[PDB]
């Protein structure tokens, strides 16, 4: 909302576990971060297969969406990488 640079220092973490925020939207830059923890971004979601996640995410809760760990994240490169995929598989997929 204001002073986005204050969060740029919060993404300096590495090796912790965060959760996807619902404050963001699909097909418009998916962002995944914590209230004061790290923050992520994904502009590649601007393509989508057929439907927009704007609705699928509208069903989630406050701060609910996904769950993973943040190991590498750049505010200038906008490159976010999680280890949730290396941690273990799952019975479902987002």
UniProtKB/Swiss-Prot annotation:
Residues found modified as N6-acetyllysine: 14
Residue ranges annotated for the S1 motif domain, each copy included: 15-85
Subcellular location: Cytoplasm
Modifications made to the protein after synthesis: Phosphorylated; probably on a serine. (Microbial infection) ADP-ribosylated and RNAylated (about 30% of the modifications) by phage T4 ADP-ribosyltransferase ModB. This results in covalent RNA-S1 conjugates and allows the phage to reprogram the host's gene-expression system.
Disrupted gene: phenotype observed: Essential, it cannot be deleted. Upon depletion cell growth and total protein synthesis become linear.
Record's note on what induces expression: Represses its own translation via the N-terminus (at protein level).
Subunit organization: Part of the 30S ribosomal subunit; the largest protein subunit, it is loosely associated and not always found in ribosomal crystal structures. Does not bind rRNA. Probably requires ribosomal protein uS2 to associate with the 30S subunit. Binds in the junction of the head, platform and main body of the 30S subunit; the N-terminus penetrates the 30S subunit while the C-terminus faces ribosomal protein uS2. Nascent polypeptide chains cross-link this protein in situ. Can be cross-linked to mRNA in the ribosome. (Microbial infection) During infection by bacteriophage Qbeta, part of the viral RNA-dependent RNA polymerase complex, the other subunits are the viral replicase catalytic subunit (AC P14647), host EF-Tu and EF-Ts.
Role this protein plays: Required for translation of most natural mRNAs except for leaderless mRNA. Binds mRNA upstream of the Shine-Dalgarno (SD) sequence and helps it bind to the 30S ribosomal subunit; acts as an RNA chaperone to unfold structured mRNA on the ribosome but is not essential for mRNAs with strong SDs and little 5'-UTR structure, thus it may help fine-tune which mRNAs that are translated. Unwinds dsRNA by binding to transiently formed ssRNA regions; binds about 10 nucleotides. Has a preference for polypyrimidine tracts. Negatively autoregulates its own translation. It is not clear if it plays a role in trans-translation (a process which rescues stalled ribosomes). Evidence for its role; binds to tmRNA with very high affinity, is required for binding of tmRNA to 30S subunit. Thought to play a role only in translation of the tmRNA in vitro. Evidence against its role; overexpression of whole protein or various S1 fragments inhibits translation, they have no effect on trans-translation, and an in vitro system with S1-less ribosomes performs trans-translation.
Family affiliation: Belongs to the bacterial ribosomal protein bS1 family.
Domain free text: The 6 S1 motif domains are not equivalent; the first 2 no longer bind rRNA but instead are involved in protein-ribosome and protein-protein interactions. Binds to the 30S ribosomal subunit via its N-terminal fragment (190 residues, the first 2 S1 motifs) and allows translation by S1-free ribosomes. The same fragment represses its own translation. The first 3 S1 motifs do however bind to mRNA pseudoknots in the 5'-UTR of at least 1 mRNA (rpsO); deletion of S1 motifs 1-3 but not motifs 4-6 is not viable, although a deletion of motifs 4-6 grows slowly and is cold-sensitive.
Protein name (record): Small ribosomal subunit protein bS1
Organism: Escherichia coli (strain K12)
Gene name linked to the record: rpsA
Shown residues within the full chain: 350 to 443 of 557
């Amino acid at each position: 909302k204001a002073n986005p640079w204050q969060q740029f220092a919060e993404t300096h973490n590495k090796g912790d576990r965060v959760e996807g925020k619902i404050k963001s939207i699909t097909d418009f830059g998916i962002f995944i971060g914590l209230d004061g923890g790290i923050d992520g971004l994904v502009h590649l979601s601007d393509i989508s297969w057929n439907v927009a996640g704007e609705e699928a995410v509208r069903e989630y809760k406050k701060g609910d969406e996904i769950a993973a760990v943040v190991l590498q994240v750049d505010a200038e490169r906008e490159r976010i990488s999680l280890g949730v995929k290396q941690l273990a598989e799952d019975p479902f997929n987002n």
